[PDB]
């Protein structure tokens, strides 16, 4: 009935972007980003930019003929900050607002059995 896709929303610091693709994962559909909107290099992860990218991505999905999505939220992971970026909530909210069915939400931020020590040295980023 309702044809699925996967959103693959990846949010971090100084960027966030959506990568809609098929259920298999090897045939993308309209990878778009919030960094394409405003060329400031300081608000690349903003809610307004993420919402603009969300409108563009939902437009591509509706024009292609997709109706349902599974959202997957990603951060830098591994050793990095591990937190979801700020724009992901605005992105998925615009996706819901765009009249697209959404189901089976989960987080896929990678997590190790720890290794590969973080940068910054022992003392860290001494700002």
């Amino acid at each position: 009935s309702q044809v699925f896709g996967v959103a693959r929303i990846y949010a971090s610091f100084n960027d966030t972007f959506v990568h809609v693709t098929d259920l298999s994962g090897k045939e993308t559909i309209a990878r778009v980003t919030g960094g394409m909107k405003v060329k400031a290099d300081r608000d690349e992860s903003s809610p307004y930019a993420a919402m603009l990218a969300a409108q563009d991505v939902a437009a591509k999905c509706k024009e292609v003929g997709i109706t349902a999505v599974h959202v997957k939220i990603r951060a830098t992971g591994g050793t990095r900050t591990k937190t979801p970026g700020p724009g992901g909530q605005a992105a998925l909210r615009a996706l819901a607002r765009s009249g697209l069915r959404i189901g089976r939400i989960e987080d896929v931020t990678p997590v190790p059995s720890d290794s590969t020590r973080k940068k910054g040295g022992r003392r860290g980023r001494r700002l």
């Binding site: 044809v3 699925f4 098929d22 259920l23 298999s24 994962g25 090897k26 045939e27 559909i29 024009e63 292609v64 003929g65 089976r104 989960e106 987080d107």
Partner: protein, 214 residues
Amino acid sequence: VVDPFTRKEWFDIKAPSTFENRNVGKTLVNKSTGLKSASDALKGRVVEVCLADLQGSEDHSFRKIKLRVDEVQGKNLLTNFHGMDFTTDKLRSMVRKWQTLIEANVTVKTSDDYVLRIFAIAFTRKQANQVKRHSYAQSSHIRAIRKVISEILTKEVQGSTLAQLTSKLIPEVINKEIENATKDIFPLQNIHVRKVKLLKQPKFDVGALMALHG
């Protein structure tokens, strides 16, 4: 400037008949053309789905299953088992402090000529009329229950060929087998498998595969 939305073609995956309702989505793959088109060359696209809406259930966001496409026919391509897993919601909901954590892992050779790895996760709890805060174990009971769990989880396999092993797994019979197998230590406890994965699929097995068609 190709505009490949018009170029690509729609296919419907089809889960095997060792399952409930098996129509489980559609894919936009590529153009079915001449000069070595890829529609009859993909043969390996893997899809991640939920057992719950696979069966029509409505209250299990966990125990997701993945399936690989094996062959294509009639623009309607049949899949086969590739592995299973849990969602990080339930696992990290179950995990908390002031309790312990048991893990076991077997790498078993089944009846048909497959080998696959299987996991087994468990925790602990507190009996009634309790006063204690934490309820940790003795670190020898842990080895004992790990031993009996690995024994049971290699006993079910090597015997219970993969096709029916999935059908015995999806009702979660093995968990409630362990719960009343080691009832002497704990009448009820929260056990799960949490992971299965194949390594060495030897041969396509078109015969049995088309026997389990849907």
